Structure formats: structure tokens, C-alpha cells
């Protein structure tokens, strides 16, 4: 009655019989931009069902040695379905997100994944190792797309900050002996009412194993982690030709 759940939006429905409730980032549901917060004057377009639906974008394999991965929003969807087209044809974009991370195993497997959302997740480099070289991360690392990217130094989140304090952000855990999914609802987070879906990534989704995956020889060794997400209250403005970046 808190373990079972159904998430229906658009022409897609998700089910889970081993949930752990739902998290609503910073305690507030997504919403459309009010006429007093807005600034751009053109009438926005709100596609609704064609873009506010669940998209399953990627599957990673959880291994005994995995370090963790991250994805950037809205980067992950800029080239998928109708949402992508609208993000490409419009200068302005804004929306919320419902993130559903899936990972099931057996009552004999163990391990725990920390699933968290970190706004304005700026990536840092190791500065040439000695820290005397001012290097910068490449586009494929700041905006990895749907395939995401693997963390090199999870302890410091590849940005000189302690992952041990990541729980100060909207998060959930996937502890195999307890639940097989994590659901986080995120409102639009920015210092502006609208912004570019291409140049700016509002937040990053981190999925990091804190307690290593383990099991005995003979049990299914392939344990996938699938990422499904849905935009909420998508709004677009500033129409012109399509642009990919």
C-alpha cells in the first residue's frame, strides 16, 4: 500500500510491486510559469501528452566493480521523440521531471544504489593530476546525452565535493533487499523562468552504488539498471528553425 505503485502519464504506464514511496523534490510539484514570473511575451506552446510521457532511454549493467554513472537533464531527451523536436525548434524551454530508476534482483542478491538529483551539476577535471594544469571537461562529458557517463572519482563526485553529503539533495536508495526502484519528482529549478534546453542542464541524475553488488556463483550475474523519465508541464517559446546545439 506504499510498496505497490502505478505511474500513468501520457500513453505510458509504469508499475512496481516493491517501491519505497515517492520523493517530491524540495517539497513542490512541477507547475507552469505564472504571468508574473514570465518575461518573454510570445504565447508559449504546451504540447501536453505528446511530450509529457515516460521515455526509457538507457540501461546500464551493475557490476561488482561499478563506480557509478550520471545523466544531465534535459540533455538526455534533446534528441528523443516529440519532446526533442520542441527543444530543438524553440529557444526557450521549461519543465519538471518524474524520474523512475529500475533495478530488480533476487532475495539472495545484495547491494545499495544511491539515486540523487543535483541541480547545476558542474563537472570538474583532475587538473592534470598535479593540479598545475587548468584543464576543462569536454562536451561529451558535460552533456553525455542518453548514454550518460561513468564517474571517475565517485568519492568527490568528479567535482571536488563529498558524495557522503549528496543526500542533502532529493534522493532515494535502491537497497535490493527492500525495493527495486526509485521515483523522484523534480520541479523546474533555475534562476530564470525559461532557458535553453541545449546550453543549460538544470540538474544531473546520479546513480551510485554505495554498498557493492554481491551474490554467490550460480545466481543471475547480469543485473541491469534502467532509466525511465517523463517531462512534466513542458512549455516552449521563441520559435524558429531546429537547432541541435
Amino acid at each position: 500500500s506504499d510498496r505497490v505503485a502505478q505511474l500513468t502519464i501520457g500513453n505510458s504506464t509504469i508499475t512496481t510491486q516493491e517501491a519505497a514511496n515517492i520523493i517530491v523534490g524540495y517539497g513542490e510539484w512541477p507547475s507552469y510559469c505564472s504571468d508574473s514570473d514570465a518575461t518573454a511575451v510570445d504565447k508559449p506552446t504546451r504540447p501536453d501528452v505528446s511530450v509529457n510521457r515516460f521515455y526509457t532511454l538507457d540501461t546500464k549493467l551493475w557490476e561488482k566493480s561499478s563506480k557509478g554513472w550520471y545523466w544531465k537533464f534535459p540533455d538526455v531527451l534533446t534528441e528523443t521523440g516529440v519532446f526533442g523536436q520542441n527543444a530543438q525548434f524553440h529557444y526557450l524551454y521549461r519543465s519538471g521531471f518524474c524520474i523512475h530508476v529500475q533495478c530488480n534482483a533476487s532475495k539472495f542478491h545484495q547491494g545499495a544504489l544511491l539515486v540523487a538529483v543535483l541541480p547545476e551539476y558542474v563537472i570538474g577535471t583532475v587538473a592534470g593530476g598535479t593540479g598545475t594544469e587548468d584543464t576543462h571537461p569536454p562536451y561529451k562529458q558535460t552533456q553525455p546525452g542518453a548514454d550518460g557517463f561513468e564517474l571517475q572519482h565517485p568519492y568527490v563526485l568528479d567535482a571536488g565535493i563529498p558524495i557522503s553529503q549528496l543526500t542533502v539533495c532529493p534522493h532515494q536508495w535502491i537497497n535490493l533487499r527492500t525495493n527495486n526502484c526509485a521515483t523522484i519528482i523534480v520541479p523546474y529549478i533555475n534562476a530564470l523562468p525559461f532557458d535553453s534546453a541545449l546550453n543549460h542542464c538544470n540538474f544531473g541524475l546520479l546513480v551510485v552504488p554505495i554498498s557493492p553488488l554481491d551474490y554467490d556463483q550460480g545466481a543471475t550475474p547480469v543485473i541491469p539498471i534502467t532509466i525511465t523519465l517523463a517531462p512534466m508541464c513542458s512549455e516552449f517559446a521563441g520559435l524558429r528553425q531546429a537547432v541541435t546545439q
Partner: protein
């Protein structure tokens, strides 16, 4: 006449076949109602037990 209790309280002889279902008029296919996104716990229409 009847005097012992089990006899007085028995259902032996009930000729009324109890019915769990009943017919409703259905001259047309059912309509479709408007629906919106639902993101709840506890509620799960999609899961069944065939």
C-alpha cells in the same frame, strides 16, 4: 410441527437460487471518459491476478 433448533434454523429447502450478478441495459458500446496522469502508490489497476 418443528421444535429442535437445528431444524428451525436450517436452510434445507431454499428454492431461491441466489445470484451474484444481474443484467443491465447496454444498447451501445460504453463511452470513454476523460483521464489525466496519475502518480499514486497503493492504486494499481494494471496489476491483476489471473
Amino acid at each position: 410441527g418443528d421444535r429442535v433448533a437445528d431444524v428451525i434454523e436450517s436452510s434445507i429447502g431454499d428454492s431461491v437460487s441466489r445470484a451474484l450478478t444481474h443484467a443491465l441495459p447496454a444498447p451501445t458500446g460504453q463511452n470513454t471518459q476523460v483521464s489525466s496522469h496519475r502518480l499514486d502508490t497503493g492504486k494499481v489497476p494494471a496489476l491483476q491476478a489471473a
